Structures are given as C-alpha cells and as structure tokens.
A paper describes a structure:
Guanylate-binding proteins (GBPs) are interferon-inducible guanosine triphosphate hydrolases (GTPases) mediating host defense against intracellular pathogens. Their antimicrobial activity hinges on their ability to self-associate and coat pathogen-associated compartments or cytosolic bacteria. GBP1 is a multidomain protein consisting of an N-terminal large GTPase (LG) domain and a C-terminal α-helical region (C-terminal helical domain, CTHD), divided into a middle domain (MD; α7–α11) and an elongated C-terminal GTPase effector domain (GED; α12–α13). In the absence of guanine nucleotides, the GED folds onto the MD and interacts with the LG domain and MD to maintain GBP1 in the resting state.
Unlike the isolated LG domain that readily dimerizes under several guanine nucleotide conditions, full-length GBP1 forms stable dimers only in the presence of GDP·AlF3. We next determined the 3D structure of Nb74-bound GBP1 dimers in complex with GDP·AlF3, yielding a pseudo-C2 symmetric 3D reconstruction at a nominal resolution of 3.7 Å. GBP1 associates through the LG domains and additional contacts between the MDs, which extend in parallel from the LG dimer in a crossover arrangement mediated by the Gly307–Val316 linker region connecting the LG domain and MD. Nucleotide binding induced partial unraveling of the C-terminal part of helix α6 (Ile304–Ser306) and the N-terminal end of helix α7 (Cys310–Val316) to form the crossover interface, in which the MD swings out to form contacts with the respective pairing monomer. This interface is primarily formed by a hydrophobic patch between the LG domain of one monomer and an aliphatic stretch of residues at the C-terminal end of the linker region and helix α7 (Ala315–Ile322) in the other monomer. While the MDs undergo a large spatial transformation relative to the resting state, the overall conformation of helices α7–α11 remains essentially unchanged with a root-mean-square deviation (r.m.s.d) of 2.03 Å relative to the nucleotide-free state. The parallel arrangement of the MD is stabilized by an electrostatic zipper along α9–α11 of the protruding stalks. The GED (residues 481–592) is likely flexible and not visible in our structure. Our structure was obtained with recombinant protein devoid of the farnesyl modification normally required for association with membranes. In this structure, the MDs point away in parallel from the LG domains, compatible with a model in which nucleotide binding primes both farnesyl anchors for membrane insertion.
Author numbering:
A (entry chain B), B (entry chain A): 6 to 483
Amino acid sequence: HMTGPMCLIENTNGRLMANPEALKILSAITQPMVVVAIVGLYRTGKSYLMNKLAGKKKGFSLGSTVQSHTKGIWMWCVPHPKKPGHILVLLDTEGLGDVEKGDNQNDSWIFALAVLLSSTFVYNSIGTINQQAMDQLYYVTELTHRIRSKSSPDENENEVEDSADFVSFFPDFVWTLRDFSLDLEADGQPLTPDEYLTYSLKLKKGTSQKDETFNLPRLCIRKFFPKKKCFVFDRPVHRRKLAQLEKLQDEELDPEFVQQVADFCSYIFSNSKTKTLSGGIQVNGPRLESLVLTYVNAISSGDLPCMENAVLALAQIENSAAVQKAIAHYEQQMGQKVQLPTETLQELLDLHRDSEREAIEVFIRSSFKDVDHLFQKELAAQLEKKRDDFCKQNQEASSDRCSALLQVIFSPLEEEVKAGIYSKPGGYRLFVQKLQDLKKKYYEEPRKGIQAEEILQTYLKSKESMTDAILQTDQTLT
Amino acid sequence: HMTGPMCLIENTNGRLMANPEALKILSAITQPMVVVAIVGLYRTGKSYLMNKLAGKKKGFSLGSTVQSHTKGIWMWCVPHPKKPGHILVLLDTEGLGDVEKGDNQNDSWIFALAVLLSSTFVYNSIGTINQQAMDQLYYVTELTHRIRSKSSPDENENEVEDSADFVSFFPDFVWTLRDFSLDLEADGQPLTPDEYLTYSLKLKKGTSQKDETFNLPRLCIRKFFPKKKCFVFDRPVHRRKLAQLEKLQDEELDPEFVQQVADFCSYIFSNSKTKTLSGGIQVNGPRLESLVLTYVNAISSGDLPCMENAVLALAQIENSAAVQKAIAHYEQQMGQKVQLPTETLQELLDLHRDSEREAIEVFIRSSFKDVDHLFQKELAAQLEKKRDDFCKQNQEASSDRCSALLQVIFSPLEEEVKAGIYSKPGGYRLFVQKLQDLKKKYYEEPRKGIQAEEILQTYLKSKESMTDAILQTDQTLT
Ligand SMILES: Nc1nc2c(ncn2[C@@H]2O[C@H](COP(=O)(O)OP(=O)(O)O)[C@@H](O)[C@H]2O)c(=O)[nH]1
Ligand SMILES: Nc1nc2c(ncn2[C@@H]2O[C@H](COP(=O)(O)OP(=O)(O)O)[C@@H](O)[C@H]2O)c(=O)[nH]1
Ligand SMILES: [Mg+2]
C-alpha cells in the first residue's frame, strides 16, 4: 500500500494545519481502520518502536542527535497483518517536553490529537512509571473531553458515561517502559508489569482530602481507559552503538528486547479494536478525514483555550486566590476590629492605612513572585475600589446615623413644641438659645461622621421655614 | 570521622520534622562546612553517586526495587578531602515523582530544602535536559525565594539582588545526566557538556508574547544559579548486574563512568565554596542546625500557599477566567442593551434574568466538567453580588435622576412660594392641587427607577415645612 509515511498535520511556530497531500491519500481508503498512536518524551525511541509496528526496516526518520527530529504528526497506512479487511494506521508524534521549542501548549495539543485520533493509545517513558507521567497523562484525558465537547453533539460527553457501550469508543491504553533495569519487586512479592501498573493506579483506603487528591488522577485514568497494559524493554544494545539502529538486524540486538518487541506487536495486533465514533459506526477513510479536519480546527480556531505553557501562570492564578484571601483578611480587620460609623475622615484614612499595612504584607506572605508588580498593583486597585466602597458605606451609614440622631434628640425636642409652644411672643429668642447651645453642643457626641457634617447644613437649610416663620412677630401684636 | 549517614529531617505521613539525633552531632562541629545537596527523579542513583562523593563503598542505603528507599533527607559529615579546615556535608534527599506516595507537594518541599541547605546543588536527571525538568527547576527557584522571605531579614530578598557580592550565597549548579546515549551534536556542530547546558539555556531573539513565555524560565534559572555546569555518565554496567553495584569494584565497571565520576568529584572538591549566609557569614555546626530548624518550621508553620498537585485542578481554576469573561459579556450587555436608570424594578429583574440566562449559556459553552458545580454556584453567587451592585447603582441613579427632575420642575415653584403671593388668604388654594399635579406629571414622565414613589414621599415628608408655616400664616391673614 504505502511505501513511506507522510506528514498528516504540520507544526510551524505553534500552528497546526491539516496536510492536504495526506488528506488526499487518507480519503482514498474505504475500509474500516485500526489506528495506533504513540506519545512520549523527546529522544526516547518512539519512531524506532513504530518502525517495528510496521515491521519494516526504514520508515519514520530516527536521528541520533540531541535535537528533536520528528515534528508534527506523521501517519502511515498499512494493511492489518492479522485482521483482514482493515487498514492499520500508525501515527508518529513529536516528542514531549522539547527544550528547543520550550512550549508545553503545543505539546499537549499534539498529545490530545494522538489520543483522540487513536483507537489504541500508546504512552512511552524511560526508566519507571512516574507521578509526573501520571499528571501529564491525566491532564490530557480531560483536555480530550474539552476538545470533543466543542465538536460532538451528544450521547457521550458530560451527560452519559457508562451503560452506553462506550468501551468501544475510548481508546485502549498501553504503557511502554524503556531501558528497564530495576528488579520488578514491591513489598516483597515480585510483580508482572500489569500488576505494577495496577499497583501504580491502586486506590487509597478512605476519603480524606489528601487521599482524594491522590485518588482523583487514578480514578479518572481508570474511567477513561477501560483496558490497560504495560510493557518493559531492556537496552537494545549493550554499548552505545545507538546511531546505527536503522541498519542493525535482530541478532545484534539483545534477544530479550526482540522477544519483548514481538510480544508487544502481537498484543497490539491481536487486541486492537476498530476505531469507532459515538453511536457505534465504524470509522473509515473519509470519516477520519473529516475527524482530523474538525479536531485541527477545534484546536487552532479560537476556542479550546489552554495556558499550560508556563508554571508562573498557574502560580499567578494561585496568587489571585491569595488576592481573594487578602481581601477576606482586610474585610475581617475592617469589620470586626473597627465600628461601622466614623469619627473623622483622617481617622478613616489612618484606619485604612493600618489595615493596608496589614493586608499588603499578608498578601506578600501568601503570594507568589509576580512580574513587574502587575498583580501587586491589581490588588492595590482592588483595595482602592474596596476603600471607595467602604467610603460610600460610611457616607450612607453616617447619613443614617445623623438622620436618626436628629430624629431622636432634635425632632422630639422641636416637632412637639413647634405646634403651639413657639406661638408665644418671642419663641425665636429662646429657640436660638435652645438649638445653638444645646443641640449643636451635644452633637459633638462621638461617632458623628465628618462626611455627615454637611447634613447639618442641609437640615438648617430645611429649617429656615420655622427659624423666623410661623409668625415670629407676636411681640408686635402684644 | 563519621562511619555512616543518618536522617536529618524525617518525612512521616507528609510531615517533615528535624531529627534531634542529627541536630546533636551538628551542634558539636565547629569547622566551616561545604554542603553538597542532591535531588532528582526517584530510582536514578542519587545515593550511589553521593557514595562516590565520600569515596566509601557502602554508605547511603541504595535499594534496588521499584519502590522508593531513601526517605526524607539523610546527612553525612566527612572531612574535606581537598580543603583543610573544612567539612564536606552530603545531603541525599528523597527522589521526586513517587507513585506510591503520589504527592507533588512534599517533593517540592524536599527539593526546596535541598536547594536552601546546599552550598552546591546537584540536579540528577535521566537521558536529556528536559522541558519538564526545567519547569520543575524553575518552579523550585521561585519557591526558595519565597521561603527565604519568611525567615531572612533583609539584604538579599526582593529588594537588592545584584552588586551585593551575592554570588557566594546562591548555590552553584551541577546538572548530571544518567545513562546518556545520544551523540553530542546540535545543528551539525559538536557540543561539550557545558555548551549543551547553555544551548538548552539559550534565549530566543526578540519580544513576542510567546517568546517572553519561552525566556521566563531560562532567565530565572540563569539569574538565581550563579555558576552552572553539566556532566554526563554512561551506564555503569553493560548488562543489568545493577542490584549488586555497592559490592562492585571499579574494574568491572566501564572505565568511562569512573573517569566521569572522578572528573565530577574533582570539580566539586576544587570549586565548591563554603556556605555563606546573607552578609557573607560562613556556616558552622550551630548555624547549620539553626538553618535546618528555621526552614523546617518555615515549611510547617502555615506557610504553604504554593501547590501544584493535580495540575488539572489548576487548569479548572481557569473557569475563573471564564467567569471573568462571562462577567465582561454581562457588563457589556448592561452597558449596551439597558439604559442606566431602567424602568421600575420588574423590567429590571426580567431583563436581568434573560441576561443571566445568556451569561449561563456562555458559561456552559466555554467551561466544562464543573466539580460538583462548585464553580457554577460560585458564578451564581458572583452574579448575585453583581445584581446587588447594579441594584445600588440603580438606586443612586434613580436618586440622581428623580432629584434632577424634581429640582428642574419644582425649584421655580418653591422659590415663588417662599417669596410670592401665597401669603394672602386663598393663596394655597392653587398649591393644594398643583403639588399632585406635579407628582402626576412626573408619573407620566418615563424612566423612573425603582425608588420613584419612595423618593417623592421623602421629598413630601421633607417639604411640609413650606406648607404648614404659611398655612398657619394664612389663618392670621384671614
Ligand atoms: N534511551 C533509549 N534510546 C533508544 C532506544 N531505542 C532506540 N534508541 C535511540 O534513540 C534515538 C532517538 O530516537 P528518535 O527516533 O529520535 O525518537 P523520537 O525523536 O521521539 O521520534 C535513536 O537514534 C535510537 O538509536 C531505547 O530503548 N532507549
Ligand atoms: N539508570 C541508572 N541506574 C543506576 C545507575 N547506577 C546505579 N543505578 C541503580 O539505581 C538504583 C539507585 O537508586 P537510588 O540511588 O536509591 O535513588 P533513590 O532511590 O532515590 O535513592 C540502584 O538500583 C542502582 O544500582 C546509573 O548510572 N543509571
Ligand atoms: Mg519521531
């Protein structure tokens, strides 16, 4: 069928575009297919391994430098050696964690494309199964949910997971270990690699919070991948004659490594299912063409936002949580330590000043290293907005306080006497002595509120109709 | 001097506690110390290489199973082989990436402790310089800065970095690569180990946004680590006769590994400096035990705001960014769809409910897989608080607007009634219908606000002063 593999999706400066020359060939296949992807760290031998999957010497380019060689996703359509009527599709993948590119965002995109387009997903790692490998694999599986949610109608996304024959939809999982050298023992009893992986995904007793954080990744991985597997391979050669592996035959390699490669290939051939979409329809060439088009567009067409390409970004989100905590801490000392109404504007100035000389250092204690004090000035703006909100709350609370104090000391001594008492010949002469020598003098009771001083002026501007009015001229009549 | 190592900080159930048996022997040593600390991926040979630093076969316990063996931090004190009067203190720390333990919180704490206590830091890795290794190393670098901010007074943290002879404070860096297999080549030109390290730490051209994301880890690494070096080591044994390595002489090992380990040991002995605190003070026994104590209490004294366990959870916290996007869309709709003093309150509530439905459909379109709908209910509470904010905004808006209307349609009337032809009997016979005439003409005037009738009622209860006085005056006129 295909003499050589050709690039399916390109990767130029962080963009992903479906390759029309690969789409043209892909559209020409009508049989249902079996797809076998792969992912793994960069310079790990992924291309060398998928050469054995095709079973042909010479294939995906290997390379032997410290630079990454395989870029983008490369397909290779071959007839299935063990299942008649179906076409085996091998996908090669750009290595994870490249230092020359230094971009985790594109890494996760290629990872997600591999798992989504795969009906048999293969992970690659060196030495041991690792917590970092678990976190990266776990993080991808939910990103796969994000991608499908933007291009799939219903029947398997976030509404119905089990009891829908979904075990044929999600890809079967395989974990490969490279250059395994440790003895397969744990707690005393030896372990088969299947038992090793299951122990790595073994749940933890009960339900604490640190136990839930432990259990959460393993549970999600178990749900995502119905069937799981694990393999181990020794070093292909004893010394480092590792640049001539494209030219070396099987006898020069370690016989155990050849046996393990044959076992892995036999497992894949005899247990890989046919890729199917939601609904059980077997996926063929044109279906794959539309699938890769939709997924590539879903990645590079606006939506699907992921900011994995940093650690400072998530640290700054935690720092935003610290802004929330500092706001709570500031509100605690501004609500419980000090009262609701006020005494003087300078008093509130100093009060907010010391509350800030607490909150800012609380921020810096619970914070992270922020660039150019961007988040620091964001907290400053947030605290300024909160200070303005508290000043409005002060101008409202002190307004109510002054109105109520007038209604409780001034009104009960003015309204009850403004009816008939001030009809006497000279009520104003003693009303001034009443007001300006008792009411204003007692108004100096603490918690006046300097923002409510103008309310006194408004009240006087409202009282001019009984200061001199209501016939303050009865002396002339008498 | 010392026959064997001992634990310095025990790590039990994720808790770090200083070991008094180790603090006691620390307290009895007076000579200055050079401290070499190691970290790396778990089950890699950290303990094996630190055995070669002391140059004694059998030492730090190795462990040859797939389970982690070295737990916590283990200290060893020896006389300095090449610096008379100094003492070499080796710190072997628990490896990162444990699957049985499965907690990135504790691994980061152990990492940070090793960096802080080290006068010479050794990062151990497998295969190649790795972007994940840079991502973790960068994350640690900020972590050590923050930890020092909780136990160091001044002169070195966040205020004065350069031009303070700080090159002695921050530890030198050695990146050791294990089981190196690739040829040393890049862009066609061969590379030395240090050239490889600086090429992986080579910054990129100019100023884009992604390029700053690229440059950010490398800038921090090259800043906080003054002197950098890299070393490569081949496989110690051709076959995997690797479980009896502590019983193995140098003859049966590959001579290249012995040569590289000798060069690395020579570099360490001839270039590692005495540990210097802030200000240049050399470290001794009491100072090192004081450092250990204060850093242990710094870690275990409620100063743990930085976490990276379940990185998908932090990617979920980007639903907060989705919340901000929904809030931006909601506020834009309020600014454009509805005018600021909306019609009464029922229309406000209905349009707000429709806009909240639009906001929630935007939220479900953008976000995904809410954990027990926690972010859903937090967005509901945020929009509830925003409804309260728009409610007081409409309250003030109605206050301003109805005040403006009443003043523009009442002030000539209130001026002409204070000084006019209303003193004569029958003058109020025109006002007694005109006040409700004005009220009804306002009622016909649109765009009231929720507090329209209430505000007019307060105006009435504040404006019987210019009714009753002249009402009584009219009685005298009659
Ligand atoms: N560490 C390791 N390297 C291998 C193994 N098998 C082959 N290699 C070498 O790894 C080198 C790079 O692999 P490469 O094809 O670049 O993988 P890719 O970059 O992920 O596509 C090849 O030159 C192989 O010689 C293995 O099992 N372990
Ligand atoms: N991959 C690798 N393993 C080694 C090397 N040297 C020793 N080992 C083995 O790796 C294990 C050492 O792990 P260890 O030193 O305990 O790391 P730790 O488990 O974190 O303390 C032992 O089995 C050693 O025999 C090496 O150069 N490369
Ligand atoms: Mg490749």
